[PDB]
């Protein structure tokens, strides 16, 4: 009789359960409370899901699948699909006017998967994560989707559940889930909520109205290809140029070196949300040469200042599309791992003339938290 | 007086003497025919040189000095110095546009040493090693330097001798010393010699012409930061990841654990030059947990395949810069401890279409051997 809440995110997924009047965000077998939305197929024929899949991307780039959420429930002709497939390192082929993911599954075998079949494997891992913690079977979930997801995208997400042996009882909007997490449904009267959702690869801004516990998505905007990955990319460019200046070595050719730098840049960025300097040190980086540079928050902000500023444009556009002033916003909800960046928090607060956002919930767990609350009601 | 030949190497040094019509490589107080180019200052005010210095590095990282050869006779502004100081665990400070090593010498006192003062202490140890075996004082030496060393680096090496109470009668090029050890100086006609020198931290390739006993260094190349250290690091990374997978323990945090693994990895690598498997076993490795893994030559080669292949590029480059073809190479000389690796010997031989290298001289001792022959002539 257990119903879990699942954030099926673009780069990470999160599972929670309402138990003893509180939401418990469930840590996976590695002790991580979020799991990469990654699936890998080894030459030996082993299926890897989550951390294991992400950690062997560099050695297995063609048969490591991610960003299936970009393709799920879309037609081949969708301009979004035509753009995305050019940048995914695994083969995407057209069958029956739909994108399919073609991978080597080992034993000289190729297999073509629908995007919802890949998402099904991610949901299987989140289901197994919940089962291990509770010590019983989990066959029911509330799953979250972007507010702008159409009927076909919502149905494909339910289908992912069915393939994974989950009854997806309700599909709920990500910004609504975030609002529920902060108990903004339990607010009395009519309130305008601005949800600012910045993840690994996507930026979503949503204007919600709440009226006596009923939510309405009034307007949505953002950038489908702006997230934390882009902030990493700006730092990567900087240090690749700086390394060539200092040592004379060009590392762009060496995938191993670039991969090692990307890992340490990601780590450095995360640290710079809670401290002002982060040391990037890599032993035997390139031709036996070592890498050592300190990234300051100032430098990180400088390298990304235009990208950070650009997040305000979709906020102004949802206010315009909603026929609202910045004074009409009653609640600001910042969710997604990238909203941890102090400069992002500063720019949003400055935009709303010093108005503090909602706080108390882990921003990369907030969507799953909301799903878990709704899952609790259905349980 | 008796003139000794000294290989003053980056990581190891070696002293030889010509006596009874043969070179004798002199074993130190511990019975080792090579001595670590290491100096350590204890809190008690004791100055340790060689084996003793290297053995207490883990407990005394800030006041254990090594790789002085990377700094000797260089200016502060030298791009080489600016890179290297970032990866040395002891303090390097600028005085009078030059690098100086600052260390705690005990009794609440700090002392700044020029690189040549640290090398002087290494030469003092090699001097005492020779004096003990000979039973008389040694005040004359021939010392080897890399072929690419400039006037300042050569003069600073002579200065290191003077500080140690040695008259450095001649500074000879390391690849020339290697060639002299194999008696290639006593060949009639104009021969082209490829010297492939792979040590603990450095890779040097030299094209020498020998014309009836007169040497010319025609071209030099290699990788200033590629050596045996890097091959260890590739194995270290593998086993740190494997241990985490099998036990759930992350050992990067514990310097004690990492130090123990590095020691056994170094021993395992050495064994894999003469056998196909090496057992790495550490009792109470991490929080009382033990470590047991077998390293095969195959796995060692796989982890380092790109680094090993990379050593062929500088060989092709010296041929190009010398306006010579592979077929023009008359002698191949492999020196340095890392040339013991079978895969390295295979790649060089395959590069030169099955041409066997010079053999008979211990590759660890070949440079010191050559220095000793030249020292024997000046005697
Ligand atoms: N402390 C932090 N500082 C900066 N960025 C962070 C921090 N923690 C996580 N992130 C970023 O959050 C992004 C992931 O967002 P998340 O909401 O977890 O995933 P998704 O992309 O699936 O929405 C990544 O780009 C990651 O680098
Ligand atoms: N049998 C062996 N197999 C592989 N590497 C070896 C072997 N013996 C020594 N080495 C390596 O040789 C390196 C030392 O090279 P050497 O020429 O003695 O010193 P230096 O670094 O001063 O040139 C170390 O990295 C050591 O691990
Ligand atoms: Ca992007
Ligand atoms: Ca190195
Ligand atoms: Ca997210
Ligand atoms: Ca050497």
3-class secondary structure per residue, A300-322: HHHHHHHHHHHCHHHHHHHHHHC
- Paired with A109 in beta bridges are A106
Q: What does each C-alpha distance from B70 to A276, B79, B84, B115, B176 come to in angstroms?
A: 33, 12, 8, 9, 20
Q: Is B218 exposed, middle or buried (0-12, 13-18, 19+ CB in 10 A)?
A: middle
Q: Are A213 and A188 in contact (CB under 8 A)?
A: no
Residue A51 sits at the chain B interface (C-beta within 8 Å): no
Catalytic residue among B54, B67, B69, B158: B69
Check if B283 is active-site: no
From the list A208, A216, A215, A206, the residue with the least C-alpha distance to A185 is A215
**Distance (Å, whole) CA A315 – CA A325:** 11
**Residue A216: CB atoms within 10 Å:** 10
Please state the φ and ψ torsions of residue B24, each to the nearest 5 degrees: -115, 110
Q: Are A326 and A353 in contact (CB under 8 A)?
A: yes
Distance B101 CA to ligand 6 centre (A): 23
Please state the φ and ψ torsions of residue A168, each to the nearest 5 degrees: -75, 90
**Distance (Å, whole) CA A38 – CA A52:** 9
Beta strands per DSSP E along B287-374:
289-296, 331-335
**Distance (Å, whole) CA A326 – CA A315:** 9
CA of B314: which chain A residue's CA is closest?
A287
**Residue B354: CB atoms within 10 Å:** 6
Note whether A246 contacts B310, CB cutoff 8 Å: no
**What H or E segment, with its residue span, contains residue B239?**
helix B228-247
Distance B199 CA to ligand 2 centre (A): 5
**Distance (Å, whole) CA B166 – CA B3:** 10
Classify residue A227 by its DSSP letter.
Answer: S
CA of A287: which chain B residue's CA is closest?
B226
The technique is X-ray
Q: Are A196 and A315 in contact (CB under 8 A)?
A: yes
Distance A368 CA to ligand 1 centre (A): 14
From the alpha carbon of A271, which atom of ligand 1 is closest?
Answer: 1
Q: What does each C-alpha distance from B232 to A284, A358, B42, B267, B291 come to in angstroms?
A: 10, 50, 28, 10, 17
**Distance (Å, whole) CA A267 – CA A278:** 9
Name which of A288, A290, A293, A294 to mutate to probe chain B: the one with the most chain B Cβ atoms within 10 A of its Cβ.
Answer: A288
**Residue A143: CB atoms within 10 Å:** 27
N-to-C CA span, chain B: 7
Check if B128 is active-site: no
Q: Are B316 and B207 in contact (CB under 8 A)?
A: no
**Distance (Å, whole) CA A114 – CA B243:** 36
Closest partner CB to A288 (pick from B79, B83, B226):
B226
| Cβ partners under 8 Å of residue A352, min gap 6 | A326, A329, A332
Closest partner CB to A292 (pick from B86, B226, B229):
B86
This structure's resolution (Å) is: 1.9
Give me the torsion for CA of A56, A58, A62, A67, rounded to 10°: 80
**Residue B232: CB atoms within 10 Å:** 20
């Amino acid at each position: 009789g257990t119903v879990v809440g699942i954030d099926l995110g673009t780069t990470y997924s999160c599972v929670g359960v309402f138990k003893n009047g509180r939401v418990e965000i469930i840590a996976n077998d590695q002790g991580n409370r979020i799991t990469p939305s990654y699936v890998a197929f080894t030459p030996e024929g082993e299926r890897l899901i989550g951390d294991a899949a992400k950690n062997q991307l560099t050695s297995n780039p063609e048969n490591t699948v991610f960003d299936a959420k970009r393709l799920i429930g879309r037609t081949w002709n969708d301009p979004s699909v035509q753009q995305d497939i050019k940048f995914l390192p695994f083969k995407v082929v057209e069958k029956k006017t739909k994108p399919y993911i073609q991978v080597d599954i080992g034993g000289g075998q190729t297999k073509t998967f629908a995007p919802e079949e890949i998402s099904a494997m991610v949901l299987t891992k989140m289901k197994e994560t919940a089962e291990a913690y509770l010590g019983k079977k989990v066959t029911h979930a509330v799953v979250t989707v972007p507010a702008y997801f159409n009927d076909a995208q919502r149905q494909a997400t339910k289908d992912a559940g069915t393939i994974a042996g989950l009854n997806v009882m309700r599909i709920i909007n990500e910004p609504t889930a975030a609002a529920i997490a902060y108990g903004l449904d339990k607010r009395e009267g009519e309130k305008n909520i601005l949800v600012f959702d910045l993840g690994g690869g996507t930026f979503d801004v949503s204007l919600l109205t709440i009226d006596n516990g009923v939510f309405e998505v009034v307007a949505t905007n953002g950038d489908t290809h702006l997230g934390g990955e882009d902030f990493d990319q700006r730092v990567m460019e900087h240090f690749i140029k700086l390394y060539k200046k200092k040592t004379g070595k060009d590392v762009r050719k060496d995938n191993r070196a670039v991969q090692k730098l990307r890992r340490e840049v990601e780590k450095a960025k995360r640290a710079l949300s809670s401290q002002h300097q982060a040391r990037i040190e890599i032993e035997s980086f390139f031709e036996g040469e070592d890498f050592s540079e300190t990234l300051t928050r100032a430098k990180f902000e400088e390298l990304n200042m235009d990208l950070f500023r650009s997040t305000m444009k979709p906020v102004q556009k949802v206010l315009e599309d909603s026929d609202l002033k910045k004074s009409d916003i009653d609640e600001i909800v910042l969710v997604g791992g990238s909203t941890r960046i102090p400069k992002i928090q500063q720019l949003v607060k400055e935009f709303f003339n010093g108005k503090e956002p909602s706080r108390g919930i882990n921003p990369d767990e907030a969507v799953a938290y909301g799903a878990a609350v709704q899952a609790g009601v259905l349980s």
